[PDB]
Amino acid sequence: TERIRNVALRSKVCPAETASELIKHGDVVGTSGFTGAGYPKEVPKALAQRMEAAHDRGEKYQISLITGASTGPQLDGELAKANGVYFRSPFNTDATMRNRINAGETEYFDNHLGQVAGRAVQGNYGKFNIALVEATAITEDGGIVPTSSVGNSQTFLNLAEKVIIEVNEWQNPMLEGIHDIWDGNVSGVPTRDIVPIVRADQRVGGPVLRVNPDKIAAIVRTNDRDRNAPFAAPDETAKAIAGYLLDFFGHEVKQNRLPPSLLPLQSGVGNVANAVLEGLKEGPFENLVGYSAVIQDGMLAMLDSGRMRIASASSFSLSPEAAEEINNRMDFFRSKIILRQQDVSNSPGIIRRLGCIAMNGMIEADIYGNVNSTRVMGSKMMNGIGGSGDFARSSYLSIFLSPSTAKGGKISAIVPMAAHVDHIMQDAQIFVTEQGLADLRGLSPVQRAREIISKCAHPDYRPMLQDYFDRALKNSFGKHTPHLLTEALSWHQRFIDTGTMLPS
Amino acid sequence: TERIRNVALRSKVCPAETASELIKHGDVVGTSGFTGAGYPKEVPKALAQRMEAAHDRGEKYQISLITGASTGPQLDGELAKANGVYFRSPFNTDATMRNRINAGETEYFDNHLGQVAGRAVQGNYGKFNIALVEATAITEDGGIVPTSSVGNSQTFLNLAEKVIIEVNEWQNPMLEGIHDIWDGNVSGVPTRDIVPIVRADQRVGGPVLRVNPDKIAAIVRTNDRDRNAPFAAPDETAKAIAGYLLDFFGHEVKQNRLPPSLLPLQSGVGNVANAVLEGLKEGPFENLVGYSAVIQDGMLAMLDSGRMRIASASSFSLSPEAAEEINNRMDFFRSKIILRQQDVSNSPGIIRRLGCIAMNGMIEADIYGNVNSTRVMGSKMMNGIGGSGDFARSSYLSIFLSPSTAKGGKISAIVPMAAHVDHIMQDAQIFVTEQGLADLRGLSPVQRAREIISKCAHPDYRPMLQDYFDRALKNSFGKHTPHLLTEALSWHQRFIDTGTMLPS
Numbered sequence A, B: 001t002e003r004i005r006n007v008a009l010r011s012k013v014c015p016a017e018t019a020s021e022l023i024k025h026g027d028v029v030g031t032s033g034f035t036g037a038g039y040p041k042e043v044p045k046a047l048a049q050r051m052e053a054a055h056d057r058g059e060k061y062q063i064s065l066i067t068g069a070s071t072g073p074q075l076d077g078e079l080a081k082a083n084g085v086y087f088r089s090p091f092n093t094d095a096t097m098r099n100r101i102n103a104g105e106t107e108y109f110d111n112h113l114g115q116v117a118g119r120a121v122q123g124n125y126g127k128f129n130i131a132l133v134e135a136t137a138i139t140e141d142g143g144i145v146p147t148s149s150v151g152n153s154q155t156f157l158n159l160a161e162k163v164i165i166e167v168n169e170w171q172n173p174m175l176e177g178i179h180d181i182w183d184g185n186v187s188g189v190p191t192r193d194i195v196p197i198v199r200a201d202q203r204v205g206g207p208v209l210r211v212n213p214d215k216i217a218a219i220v221r222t223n224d225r226d227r228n229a230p231f232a233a234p235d236e237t238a239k240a241i242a243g244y245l246l247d248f249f250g251h252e253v254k255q256n257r258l259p260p261s262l263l264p265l266q267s268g269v270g271n272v273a274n275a276v277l278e279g280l281k282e283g284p285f286e287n288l289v290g291y292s293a294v295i296q297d298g299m300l301a302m303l304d305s306g307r308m309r310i311a312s313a314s315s316f317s318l319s320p321e322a323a324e325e326i327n328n329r330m331d332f333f334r335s336k337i338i339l340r341q342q343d344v345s346n347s348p349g350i351i352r353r354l355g356c357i358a359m360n361g362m363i364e365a366d367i368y369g370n371v372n373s374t375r376v377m378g379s380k381m382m383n384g385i386g387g388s389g390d391f392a393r394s395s396y397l398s399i400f401l402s403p404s405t406a407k408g409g410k411i412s413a414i415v416p417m418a419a420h421v422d423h424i425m426q427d428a429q430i431f432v433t434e435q436g437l438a439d440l441r442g443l444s445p446v447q448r449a450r451e452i453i454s455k456c457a458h459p460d461y462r463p464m465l466q467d468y469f470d471r472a473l474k475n476s477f478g479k480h481t482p483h484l485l486t487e488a489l490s491w492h493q494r495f496i497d498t499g500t501m502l503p504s
C-alpha cells in the first residue's frame, strides 16, 4: 500500500542524488534521528559521495549538522568519512564522527538534549537551510508521520527554508498513531505555553508533524534499516549493580519514601542502565511507568512482560533482535508507547512534576560525587551529555551507575577528582557499582566521600582513594571539600603516562 | 496597633528564653530567612547562650539548621560562635559560620535553592522537629504574615512537629499583602501541581502562610533589625562590566533577538550583579520586569525610577539605607513587588517559561567557560551555589559577571581549569569582565577558549592562558577539550604556595 497518501505531493518525489544537490556548502542542516532511530539515510550517502568529489577538485563542501541526538552509519558515519561536517550538535555515537571531533576536524558542542530546539529557535546554530526528515508516511492532508523517533523534527521543519522528506518503506506502517506532536509553544518565543502533561501516558497533541507544503522541496523514497547496535551481554557487574539498586528500591518502598509501583522511570543510553532494566523485568515491582528519553531493549522487555504499563520517550533505541520483535507485534506495542518531541520528553518542568527516577551511566565520579559523563582524561569526547543533565537535575532521585573500574581494571571509575564535570554534587544522590551502593542524600561533601569510597570504589583502589582523602583532610587549603591540587588529577596523568592508574 | 490579631493565640506568647527550651539537642530546625531578610532573631540568641552553658558542663547541644538561604548575625553568627550547629543547609554568608564549615566543624551541603523544600519533604534532612519563623503579624483566622522574605517557611511549617513564631515589630506592617503563598503542591509528593504562573506579576495564592494552630508551641514578640550589609561602592570594574552588558543588550534588541523591554530579569546575590543593575537604572531600556530570587538595592532602585515596572522574588536583600527607603515608602513599593516561595521563585519550569535572563557573579571560569561559584582553590567554601543553578540552566540567556582578577591582581578569575565546577559549559552563554564580553552561543569548547581569552582575561594573564591553550592543543590526550593535566590546576597551587598566580 502507498505511503504518500496525499496525491499532490507525489509530484515532488525525486531521487536521493538529485535531492542532495539542494544542500549547499556552509548550510546548517537539521535532521531527524535520535539514538540511532529515524535518521535520514539515502540523501546523506548521496551527499557524502558528492562531497568527496568536490574535495578532489579542491572545492570546499561542508555542512553544520544539527540533529535530535545520535544517528547512524548512513549519516554520521558517511559524512565523517567524507569529511563533510564543520559543526555538529548535540549528540553522537559514531566512531568516524567521534574521531573527527577528537582530532579537531569537526567542531562539537553537546547541548542538553531538551534545550536544543529552544536554542535552534533562538538562532544559536545560525539559520537553518535544510530540514531533512525521515517519515513513515504522508497523510492525506500533508502531515508527516515520523518513524522510530520524534526528536527535534518538528522544530527543524518549522525553521528550515527548504524541506526534504525520506519516506522509508522499512519502517512499520503501524508506527502511525504512536507519536504525540504538540502545536503548543514549548521551545519558541517566550512566554511559552504550559505543557499540560500531568500523566506519563497523557496525549496532548496529534499523530503527525506539520509543515507548509510549499517548503517541501523534495521527497525521496527509501528502504533502509535503522542500524542500531546490539546491547552488550549483561555480565557479572551488570547483575550486581541491578541487585543493589533493586534492594534499594525495596527499602525505599518499605520506608514509604516510594510507592510500590515506584515512580516514572528514566534510563539513559548505554549498556549498564539497560542491564539494570533487565533486572527489573524480573523484580517484585509492578504497574511501572516509563518517562524517559529512550526506550532501550530492556524497557521494551518490561512492556512485553507487563511489568511496565506504559512508556513515554522520544525514540526507541533497540538492538536488531528487539527491533524485529516490535516490527512484528507492532499492533501490541503501539498502545504501550508514546513517542514525544525531545523538548517535551526532556522538559525539566514535566520531569520534576511527574517526579521521575533518573538512572544514568557515567565515565567516572570523584570521591565527592561530581560526575563525568563525556570526556575521558578531561579532553577526549565519548558520546555527549545527552539528556543526563535534563533528568539528573530535574528528577525526584538521581542515580548513577558504573563498573567500579574501566579498561580491564587499569582505570578507576572513582577518582580523587573528575577530569571533566557534567553533573555537580547537587545533581547526584545515589551511586551504584558492583561493589555496592552509596546513598548521599543529606550529606556534606566529606560525608559523601566516606560513602563513595567505602561502598562503590574497587578494592584495588579504595586504599589509594582513602589515602588521598586522609591527606587532603590534613593539608587542603580549605577543609569543606578537601583536595591536594598537586595530585588531584595525577591518576589520569599516570594512566596517560603508563597505561594504568595502578602504581608500579 | 496589635500585631497578633487573632486573640486566642496571644495566650501562647512566651519569652524568647522559654521558647528556646523547646529546641532539643539533635533537632532538625527549619527557619525563615533568605539573603539576610526575615530570619528569626531572638530565639536563636537565647538558644545560643543556653548552648554554651550546656557545653561548659560537658553536655552535647547541637542542631541541624535548615533555612531558606543566608540569614544574619543573630542566627548563623550566634550559633556558629556557640558552636551549636552540626549540620547546615543550603546557603550561608556569615563569617563565623563560614569558618566552622571550612574547618570541618559544621557539616554543609549547598542544595539548589529551588530544590530545598522538595528535598526536605522527601526526608533528606531528616524529620523536622522545629519550624522557627519570623512574622509581620498574625491574622484574625490564624494566618502568618511573612516578613522581608518567604523562602521555605511554608514547607517548614508543614513539616515541623512544633512551631515557634516571632512577631517582629521592626518589620513594616504594610508588608501584609505583599506575599503570594500557594496552597498548590509545588514541592510535595508527585504528581505535583502545575504552577500556573504565566506572567511575572501574576498572583496565584494568598497573603499568608497557613499552619495548624495546635502546632504553634510558642509565639515570641520581638523588635530587631534585618542586619543586611551595605553594597560595595561600584568601582571601575563594575561600570565597565555594566557598559559591555548594556551594549550587548542593545545589539540583541537591534537584531530582534530580544524585545525593547528585554525579558524578565534575574540578578544574583553579590556586589557585581548589583552594580550592573545600577547601570540599567540609567540605561535606554524601559518596561522592565524582574523575575528573580532576590531584590537587591539596585533592583529596588529601578522600581523607584519606574524603569522596572514590577519585580518578583523570594526576598529583598537591601542595604541599611535602602531598607530605610522602603520602610518609609512601603505604600508605593508594596504594589511593585511580589514575594513568593523560593520553590516558586526558583522553579525551573517557570523560569524557562517566562524566558528569564540570568545574571550571576562567579569566583572563576576556566578557558572553556566552566564556572566556579563556591569553592576557592576547590576546597574552601565561600557562600554557596544558591539559585545560580536554578536560573543559569533554566534561563533564556545565562550570563556570568566578574572582575577579571581577584585579590588585588594576585589571582586570575580566568584559569586553565576551574578548581571546582558549579556551572558546566552548557549552562553559560555569556561572560563579562572589565576587559570585555564573550558571546559563546553556538561555539565548540575550543572556540569558547579563543573568545574567553581574547575578550575577558586580564592582560597580565592573557599570554599565560594563551600559552597553556596553545600547548594543550598540541599535546592534550584528546583535542576536543584540550588540557595539560600536569599544569591544569598549577595556577591554584602556585597561589597556595606563593600568594600569587603570577610567576616570579
Ligand SMILES: CC(=O)CCCNC(=O)CCNC(=O)[C@H](O)C(C)(C)COP(=O)(O)OP(=O)(O)OC[C@H]1O[C@@H](n2cnc3c(N)ncnc32)[C@H](O)[C@@H]1OP(=O)(O)O
Pocket: A035, A069, A113, A267, A268, A269, A270, A271, A272, A273, A293, A294, A360, A361, A362, A363, A364, A372, A373, A374, A376, A382, A383, A384, A385, A386, A387, A388, A391, A403, A405, A406, A407, A411, A412, A413
Ligand atoms: C539519550 C539520553 O541522553 C538519555 C539520558 C541519559 N544520557 C546519557 O547518560 C548520555 C551520556 N552517557 C553515556 O554516553 C554512557 O552512559 C557512558 C558514560 C559512555 C557509559 O557507557 P556504558 O555503556 O553505560 O558503560 P561502559 O560499557 O562501561 O563504557 C562504554 C565506553 O566508555 C568507556 N569508559 C567507561 N568508563 C570509562 C572510564 N572511567 N575511563 C575511560 N573510559 C571509560 C568504556 O571503556 C567503553 O569504551 P569502549 O567502547 O572503548 O570499550
Ligand SMILES: CC(=O)CCCNC(=O)CCNC(=O)[C@H](O)C(C)(C)COP(=O)(O)OP(=O)(O)OC[C@H]1O[C@@H](n2cnc3c(N)ncnc32)[C@H](O)[C@@H]1OP(=O)(O)O
Pocket: B035, B069, B113, B267, B268, B269, B270, B271, B272, B273, B293, B294, B360, B361, B362, B363, B364, B373, B374, B376, B382, B383, B384, B385, B386, B387, B388, B391, B403, B405, B406, B407, B411, B412, B413
Ligand atoms: C540568592 C541567589 O542564589 C540568587 C541567584 C544567584 N546566586 C549566586 O550566584 C550565589 C553564588 N554567588 C556568590 O556567592 C557571589 O556571586 C560570589 C561568587 C561570591 C561573587 O561575589 P561578588 O560580591 O559579586 O564579587 P566580589 O566582591 O568580587 O567577591 C566576593 C568575595 O569573593 C572573593 N573572590 C571573588 N573572586 C575570587 C577569585 N577568583 N578567587 C578568590 N576569591 C575570589 C572576593 O575576594 C571576595 O572575598 P572577600 O570578602 O574575602 O574580599
Ligand SMILES: [Cl-]
Pocket: A193, A194, A195, A196, A349, A350, B349, B353
Ligand atoms: Cl511547563
Ligand SMILES: [Cl-]
Pocket: A440, A441, A442, A443, B109, B111, B119, B124
Ligand atoms: Cl540533599
Ligand SMILES: [Cl-]
Pocket: A349, B193, B194, B195, B196, B349, B350
Ligand atoms: Cl509548573
Ligand SMILES: [Cl-]
Pocket: A111, A119, A124, B440, B441, B442, B443
Ligand atoms: Cl549553544
